[PDB]
Amino acid sequence: QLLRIDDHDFSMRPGFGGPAIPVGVDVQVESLDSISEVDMDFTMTLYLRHYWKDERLSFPSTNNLSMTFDGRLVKKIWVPDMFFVHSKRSFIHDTTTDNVMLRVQPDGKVLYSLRVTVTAMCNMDFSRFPLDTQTCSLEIESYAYTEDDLMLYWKKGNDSLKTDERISLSQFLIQEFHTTTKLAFYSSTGWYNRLYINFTLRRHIFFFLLQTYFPATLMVMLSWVSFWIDRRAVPARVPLGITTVLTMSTIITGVNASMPRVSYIKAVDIYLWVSFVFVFLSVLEYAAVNYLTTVQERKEQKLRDTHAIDKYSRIIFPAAYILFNLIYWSIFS
Amino acid sequence: QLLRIDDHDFSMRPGFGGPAIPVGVDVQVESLDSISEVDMDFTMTLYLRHYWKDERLSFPSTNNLSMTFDGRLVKKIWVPDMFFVHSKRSFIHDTTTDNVMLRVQPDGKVLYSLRVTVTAMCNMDFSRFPLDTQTCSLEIESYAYTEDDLMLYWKKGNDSLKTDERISLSQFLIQEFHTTTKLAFYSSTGWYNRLYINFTLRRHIFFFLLQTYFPATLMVMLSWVSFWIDRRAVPARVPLGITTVLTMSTIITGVNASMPRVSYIKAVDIYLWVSFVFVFLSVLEYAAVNYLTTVQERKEQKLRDTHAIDKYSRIIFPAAYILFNLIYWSIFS
Amino acid sequence: QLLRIDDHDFSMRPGFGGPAIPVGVDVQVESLDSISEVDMDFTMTLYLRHYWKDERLSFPSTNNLSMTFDGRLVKKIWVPDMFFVHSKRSFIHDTTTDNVMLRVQPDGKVLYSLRVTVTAMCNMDFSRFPLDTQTCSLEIESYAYTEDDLMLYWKKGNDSLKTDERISLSQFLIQEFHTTTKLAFYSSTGWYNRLYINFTLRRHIFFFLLQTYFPATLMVMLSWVSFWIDRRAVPARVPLGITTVLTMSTIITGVNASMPRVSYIKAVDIYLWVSFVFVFLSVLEYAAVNYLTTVQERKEQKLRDTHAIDKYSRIIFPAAYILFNLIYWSIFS
Amino acid sequence: QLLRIDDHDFSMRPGFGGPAIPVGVDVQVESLDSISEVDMDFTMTLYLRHYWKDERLSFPSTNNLSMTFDGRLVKKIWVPDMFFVHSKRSFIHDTTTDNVMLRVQPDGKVLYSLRVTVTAMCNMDFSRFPLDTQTCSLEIESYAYTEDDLMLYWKKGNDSLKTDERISLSQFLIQEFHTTTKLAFYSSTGWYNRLYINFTLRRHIFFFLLQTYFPATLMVMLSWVSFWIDRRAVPARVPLGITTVLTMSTIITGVNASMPRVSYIKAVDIYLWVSFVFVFLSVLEYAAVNYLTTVQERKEQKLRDTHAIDKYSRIIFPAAYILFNLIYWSIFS
Amino acid sequence: QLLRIDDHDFSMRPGFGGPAIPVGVDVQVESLDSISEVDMDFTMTLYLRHYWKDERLSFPSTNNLSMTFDGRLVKKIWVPDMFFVHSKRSFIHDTTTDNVMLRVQPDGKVLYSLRVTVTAMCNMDFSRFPLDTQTCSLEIESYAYTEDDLMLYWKKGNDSLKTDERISLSQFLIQEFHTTTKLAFYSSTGWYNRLYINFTLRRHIFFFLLQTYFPATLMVMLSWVSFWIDRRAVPARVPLGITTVLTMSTIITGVNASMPRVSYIKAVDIYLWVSFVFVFLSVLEYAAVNYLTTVQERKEQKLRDTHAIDKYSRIIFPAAYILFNLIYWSIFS
Numbered sequence A, B, C, D, E: 001q002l003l004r005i006d007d008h009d010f011s012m013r014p015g016f017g018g019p020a021i022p023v024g025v026d027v028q029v030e031s032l033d034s035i036s037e038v039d040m041d042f043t044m045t046l047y048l049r050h051y052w053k054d055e056r057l058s059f060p061s062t063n064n065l066s067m068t069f070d071g072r073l074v075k076k077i078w079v080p081d082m083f084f085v086h087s088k089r090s091f092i093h094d095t096t097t098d099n100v101m102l103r104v105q106p107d108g109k110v111l112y113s114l115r116v117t118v119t120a121m122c123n124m125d126f127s128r129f130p131l132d133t134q135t136c137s138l139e140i141e142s143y144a145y146t147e148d149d150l151m152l153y154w155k156k157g158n159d160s161l162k163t164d165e166r167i168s169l170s171q172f173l174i175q176e177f178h179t180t181t182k183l184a185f186y187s188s189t190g191w192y193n194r195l196y197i198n199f200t201l202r203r204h205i206f207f208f209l210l211q212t213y214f215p216a217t218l219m220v221m222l223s224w225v226s227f228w229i230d231r232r233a234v235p236a237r238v239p240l241g242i243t244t245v246l247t248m249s250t251i252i253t254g255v256n257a258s259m260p261r262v263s264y265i266k267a268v269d270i271y272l273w274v275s276f277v278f279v280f281l282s283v284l285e286y287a288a289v290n291y292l293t294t295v296q297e298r299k300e301q302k303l304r305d306t307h308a309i310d311k312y313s314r315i316i317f318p319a320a321y322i323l324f325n326l327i328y329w330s331i332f333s
Ligand SMILES: CC(=O)[C@H]1CC[C@H]2[C@@H]3CC[C@@H]4C[C@H](O)CC[C@]4(C)[C@H]3CC[C@]12C
Pocket: A284, A287, A288, A289, A291, B221, B224, B225, B228, B314, B315, B318
């Protein structure tokens, strides 16, 4: 045996009973798997690396070069106890064997690597949906050892994070990867040090335009064609107005199926409900025209063209909706 | 080896054959994950801590300070056997290692911690849905040892429960965290002691207003516009009344898709079905008007304006529906 | 060590090579989780207890009282091999440790307990759905040992089964818990003894009334209003009849989504399809009225009020449907 | 210890370095769980038994009778290495212990049994859906040992397969269980012997008749009522024809939701699409009638009853559809 | 024991501290399970084989033939550490035992085999959907050892890949299986060698023709029948045009339910939206005809047949749509 494993008790950390042992971390992100709006979490796959020194693993050599071991020797030596804070579920790949790397230098320096998949929560805001921008983070912390026994820091500062060029999401644009560090306090155990990985996401608006914004606009313009039809065709204009109202209600209902039950109004809800009001006022407009015409006929009868409401509605209704779009798209850009 | 583990048989609890061993518990809640109405359960993630004393783990030292071990020594010493009563499923996180903490003082005091996710059942009541308030609880009990062998109590009374400030639910408001204690009896094993964690939830009404209450009101008001149309347009008023009835039926059906098949009427069902009656009576109203007009024409013919029903319906129908809303919102607030 | 475990080979049952060893069973039901109509199975959580005697586990004492062990000693002694027959999936809870209890008396009597969740199949009949009553059972049997080596019986007869007062199902009513016993034969291994747990379930009819029976009745009564409208309004009565037919077809389709593809007619199908016939005959009725009127006009023209069909339909159609309901609800109660 | 396990190295099969060792197999089927059309696989639960001889397990006795061991001794002796070919997933039940039986005779004969659940693929054909008949099979083969080291055969020929009388499927009829045997060749490892279990399935047509065939026929007959209505009611006959076309399209769409995206036409698709053509031609028929009537009026006007198309359509349309059904049901029976 | 396993430490690879050890790979594909457009991944089942030499496993013999071991000896010897890059999830079958083969020759040559199921991501493009062609690949790489310690290559070059003749997909056509090799670099660990398996997929167009292209064409031709109806029937032509617009909108909405929310327009979207424009212009066409007729009547009145727009529309509208189809199918073939 090259290493004298059997001659030491590895239940105690290096420098037991003394100062803390420094540990460095490197991370390479492989891919982001999925994002859920209803559950408000994301899935990430990454490579995690650790650096430390242990004099008990020293062996004699003349080349002074790192040597690689099969990786099942890990379960017999001391290893850090990092865990992902605020995670929902995670696992380590084990095909065809445990994805574990162990390299030991002659002086005792140790390199340890893993391949894990982690699901973590992210508090998203949907006030500006679907034109919103979201920021999420991943947290790494040691579970058992406090800052007085283990010091956790990035190995090379800002250069310790790498990303694969194949990272891509169909619905989101990924940007601004950076790392930060902060302390954490638990009231009954002590102080701990945390590491952060931050990134930003931006949606794509093309799908929502074709699916929601364009059908809504067309249904509104369908109601405007009733102002150019003769008012004597009562069974022709009434069904046109009513059916557009019901179809607009169907479009409104279908949008909410894919989103969580938030307690505030979203940007898309404003567009849909104002459009519903425009179609609803179209139905009331003809009822006023029909009622006034009948009253006039009876008044003229008791003595023994285009109605002004229709003439003005052809101009006011298109003008108001255009003004609404100008204001709406100026606020949400 | 610092601890004389091999010199003792840890298959027997401390004080075996004598009085009970006291055990203290501390809990910190991390987050609540999800709530299911159809399955009537909730998911919680928390940190669980235990306190006890064991003289067999004593070691000599001069500093009199707690020492931390890697946590894989737990499987070789005596550990309590707590379990969650009335739980459906649960697990312990194990990445990158088992989330276990073990700290032993020189005199033998032991601190043990875990990170678990538990799903537990809750009997909810939906009589006042969606304006309901629900209360749920989590129960902790020892499986194997009765009160004559193990005493279970909160470590610091009311101060033993802590909550993270990031706990949030999109649909519910969380309040009133407190802890209680009660005994339990099993007819064939004996008496046990239980610990409780209680909290309260309140829904948000904004989503249900826009989705159910507002579309229902608009469809009712669509039926009222038929009272202002000339009664000679038979193919104009009949389709208007019929189509609103069918659309109201569609709205009623869609609501029940998201709820369990309870055997009592809910608050939302009352609003929807009374609205359906209002629209249904609108269809019968014109049929009476049409029939009476035809009878009058034949009666006048055999001898060789606005009908009174329409005139009164314009006032009675809006007044009745307003009175219903006043009573309905006064009862359910 | 209190027990002389190392001095015996526990690969052989007590009384090896001789008469059978009696084993007693006690069960306490905790809850029933879910019932699936499409898969025809149910989920149950329960506590399972075993009783037997083994002289190899005797230890000296003066108090003659049961002693409790941590439960990880189970994997080193002989334990019965019970399994659930006709089960689909099952598991044993293991948080924070294996839910196992082991108690040994000085003379060698052993008490063993477990907490398990079991899914088992049940052959349900839906001929009278949704007014049906279903009976299901759970079976317990030893896998390896026949009746010549192990005798299985209830510990206290009818008193061996206990149920939690919190057992409840939202859609079903649970009643009539009792236990029975019967032998089983396998053609290639021998005879075995089985234990049974039986219970009965009854549905709640409130949900199905509001969801299926009430909308169906209202759509039929909508078709009857066409008999009171003037027959000269052809474009008014034709759409009314046609649209009710299509809506009734939609209601029929939606019911079958939640049920398995059985090969026999159910009680709810009878109500829906007879209702469809009533609406369908309404459409044919006006076509006969319209055709006869046109023929009469041409006959009178070639020589140079209310039609009798409408008058009789106002009485016959409501009377027939009322008679159908009287017969239908008298058979299915 | 009755068996001299420690005196032998069980890493080598019996008769190592010599002729092959015969192994017999018996199977008893317990139930079939589910069948998936989209994934094209089935789930089966069964008992698997093995027979062989090993002189290293002999023990002295005077009774010459089989003795049963607890089953955890299996992990210390040589056991065959059978696996299920073309399986997707499978597992062995382990509650409350591993479902393993081990019986050894004095001369060394060994009986070994297991309880497993296996999911296996089946290539189904849907050309005659839903009147199709499917055949599937389950394959058993040894993984490591070729025919020169292990011979695999059925223990008792045709009598080696047994089935439980409780096997039942709600949608399928199960028949014709039988077993066969065939050799298999792998280009880089050698020859192997396989065992087969075959069965046949037949669907139930009742559900599809009520759900698809009956609604389709009724919608076609609804279009025929327009031939008996006066041709002067243009706004009465046009909506009747159009609405039946759209409803027929809805019925066609709903059927394909439950089936995989095959690349050939099915039997049910033929019925639905021919029915759509019949309804579509009804709409074109009235357009021809309306156009010819207007032309005739203008021709007669410029000089200063029932149309023949309607008269013939009342006979030709019902006759053609009846002939189609006679041919359709004669081919597919 | 035939092998001297206990006399060596298998935590170090063969040739430790020296040149790299060559490893050969063979693959046989069994089946492809499923393809997901929303998640952009595929599932594959395959057999993986490894070849290497280890002098520590040599044993004496006179026949010079491969010997097969039960496969549980794998966990005690050195085995490569291959893993699938860019995979989402995977597992190894373990019924009725681990699907592992181990064969060792007298000189130390080792053959190792596995049966695994792997899910891997594939970046698909839907610009030409549903007439698109997709290419995907599977990557194999060693996790722990770099090119200086382990050399990875195909055992027999182009002949190392085999496929089962039963591989089939209902919606796709599989072709062009081939293998390639390329190096990979990680910035913090070194150089690695990768192996690739490539294949191509082509969709079947039959389903999409009947489901989307044919219903869209028929609805357009329904709007053309309004040009042959007398223009004095205002309540007859207006509902015909309006209802076809709404039905076309429904067809457009239903298509997008099964596809991911991409940010570019697809081939099917072009056909659907141009068809919607054709139906929309039909509604505006009659409004122009109706308005001009009313103006002409008033102009002639104030002084005290077929309109030209309808005559030309009968020719221009069919001609334009035919030209569009010729261009559309010439580009996308
Ligand atoms: C006087 C007049 O131009 C009539 C025509 C349609 C009528 C409205 C129809 C819908 C409502 C009916 C309700 O009964 C009274 C308020 C509402 C809003 C009516 C107010 C009076 C209107 C506007």
